[PDB]
Design a protein around this ligand. Structure first.
Ligand SMILES: Nc1ncnc2c1ncn2[C@@H]1O[C@H](COP(=O)(O)OP(=O)(O)OP(=O)(O)OP(=O)(O)OC[C@H]2O[C@@H](n3cnc4c(N)ncnc43)[C@H](O)[C@@H]2O)[C@@H](O)[C@H]1O
Lengths: 230, 233
């Protein structure tokens, strides 16, 4: 009897779970993939990423602490904003608060911005200093202007991560969402894969139900070996 | 020979989207009706194109044209809906907002170096800022925080014919949401959309479907009205 491993399959390089949506989307376009598997370091299938996932994330109610819940990393934020770090709290993995644009006056920031927040700000030293004083978990300086040495020093002392992006505040706000790791967004449950072990006749029965265009293929050990079209 | 035509097949009747409908509204309809795509049609219900999550993603993920409101002729209505905003003044002779979207974070005097006649400015409660934005002849003033501006500012707007609206959202949120106001016809697949006609023979549509491997195809009738959608066999 003919098994799935006897079928020719599409080759498919899985995404790591920690890769940004930005990186993931660039890969999906580059290969013309509507969806792509996500796998761990041992190549075990973790989930699947598609533009259905990505759009739902963008269109559906934004959790305020989404960076925290996704455990979005600094490297993800830095690549996504084409940003450079002027100081890093190297003992922090996770940015716990909400993302806020520091559009206000310095004296007013207290009311909107609190400890652990991610603050997007411009090139005003006065504003930066106050955000540092408020213990934002992350200060994102927009406009491409790296803060003064004084500000950098204040941040070193307080262990505030400070980065600078060339993008203005509107664009940075749009971009930051694309920092999210794929594992936060992907389909995980009732992902339908097929095993190299499975009989084709049985797989026809399983494809009958589901209606998807593509199914990742796994081996005896749950490792991602490819995908096949219906 | 009597041959099976598309009209003989089972098809999904989908009410098509009007082209001016916002991405936000489109997606709510799509998500509700469990669609992965949805046809876009003109007033005579002729096919203009198709919307999928691939179009939407590509547009949302592309941050490179700060001028997309202009290029897309996004309507004030769409923006109002998307930002749950209310208008305080409207320039009735303007259909199009021609500049760039910009968060007005700076101090009043500095606004003039980033913000330019025709721009779309996202601004806070500060009346000083609101009035400089109006003097700079922004095409659209969006006030954040649900802070409907003062009667003074509204009258300054009236005089200079600056459209002004107010959203409950803060500036980060307004920035993140505003691209959802784009009309579907800016975003939809237009070129190389593959449709089938009711009177097409199923035989010949089987070939077409093998040449292109899309999962669904819009069906148009013998007078070119959108009559629904058929699944790949
Ligand atoms: N006639 C036409 N002419 C011109 N252009 C056209 C066209 N038709 C479509 N296009 C354009 O081209 C794009 C791709 O077209 P299509 O190739 O038709 O793809 P699709 O059906 O829209 O997406 P997909 O194949 O992933 O849907 P599925 O049910 O498998 O999966 C749906 C979702 O479920 C999830 N999923 C997928 N596989 C899964 C699995 N094995 N297990 C669990 N979940 C899975 C994924 O999140 C996925 O997003 C479209 O976005 C559209 O813009």
């Amino acid at each position: 009897k003919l098994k799935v491993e006897d079928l020719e399959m599409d080759k498919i390089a899985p995404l790591a779970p920690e890769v940004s949506l930005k990186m993931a989307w660039n890969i999906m376009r580059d290969k013309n993939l509507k969806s792509i598997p996500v796998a761990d370091g041992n190549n075990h299938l973790l989930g699947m990423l598609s533009t259905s996932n990505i759009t739902a994330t963008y269109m559906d109610i934004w959790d305020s602490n989404i960076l925290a819940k996704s455990a979005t990393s600094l490297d993800n934020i830095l690549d996504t904003l084409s940003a450079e770090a002027q100081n890093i709290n190297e003992e922090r993995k996770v940015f716990p608060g909400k993302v806020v644009v520091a559009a206000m006056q310095a004296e007013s920031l207290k009311e909107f911005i609190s400890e652990g927040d991610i603050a997007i700000a411009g090139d005003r030293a006065e504003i930066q200093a106050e955000l540092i004083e408020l213990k934002v978990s992350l200060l994102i300086v927009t406009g491409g202007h790296t803060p003064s040495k004084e500000i950098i020093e204040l941040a070193k002392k307080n262990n505030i991560t400070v980065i600078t992006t060339p993008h203005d505040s509107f664009t940075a706000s749009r971009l930051i969402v694309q920092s999210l790791p794929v594992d936060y967004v992907m389909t995980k449950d009732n992902l339908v894969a097929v095993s190299t072990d499975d009989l084709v006749e049985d797989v026809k029965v399983t494809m009958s139900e589901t209606r998807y265009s593509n199914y990742p293929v796994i081996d005896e050990n749950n490792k991602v070996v490819g995908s096949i079209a219906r």
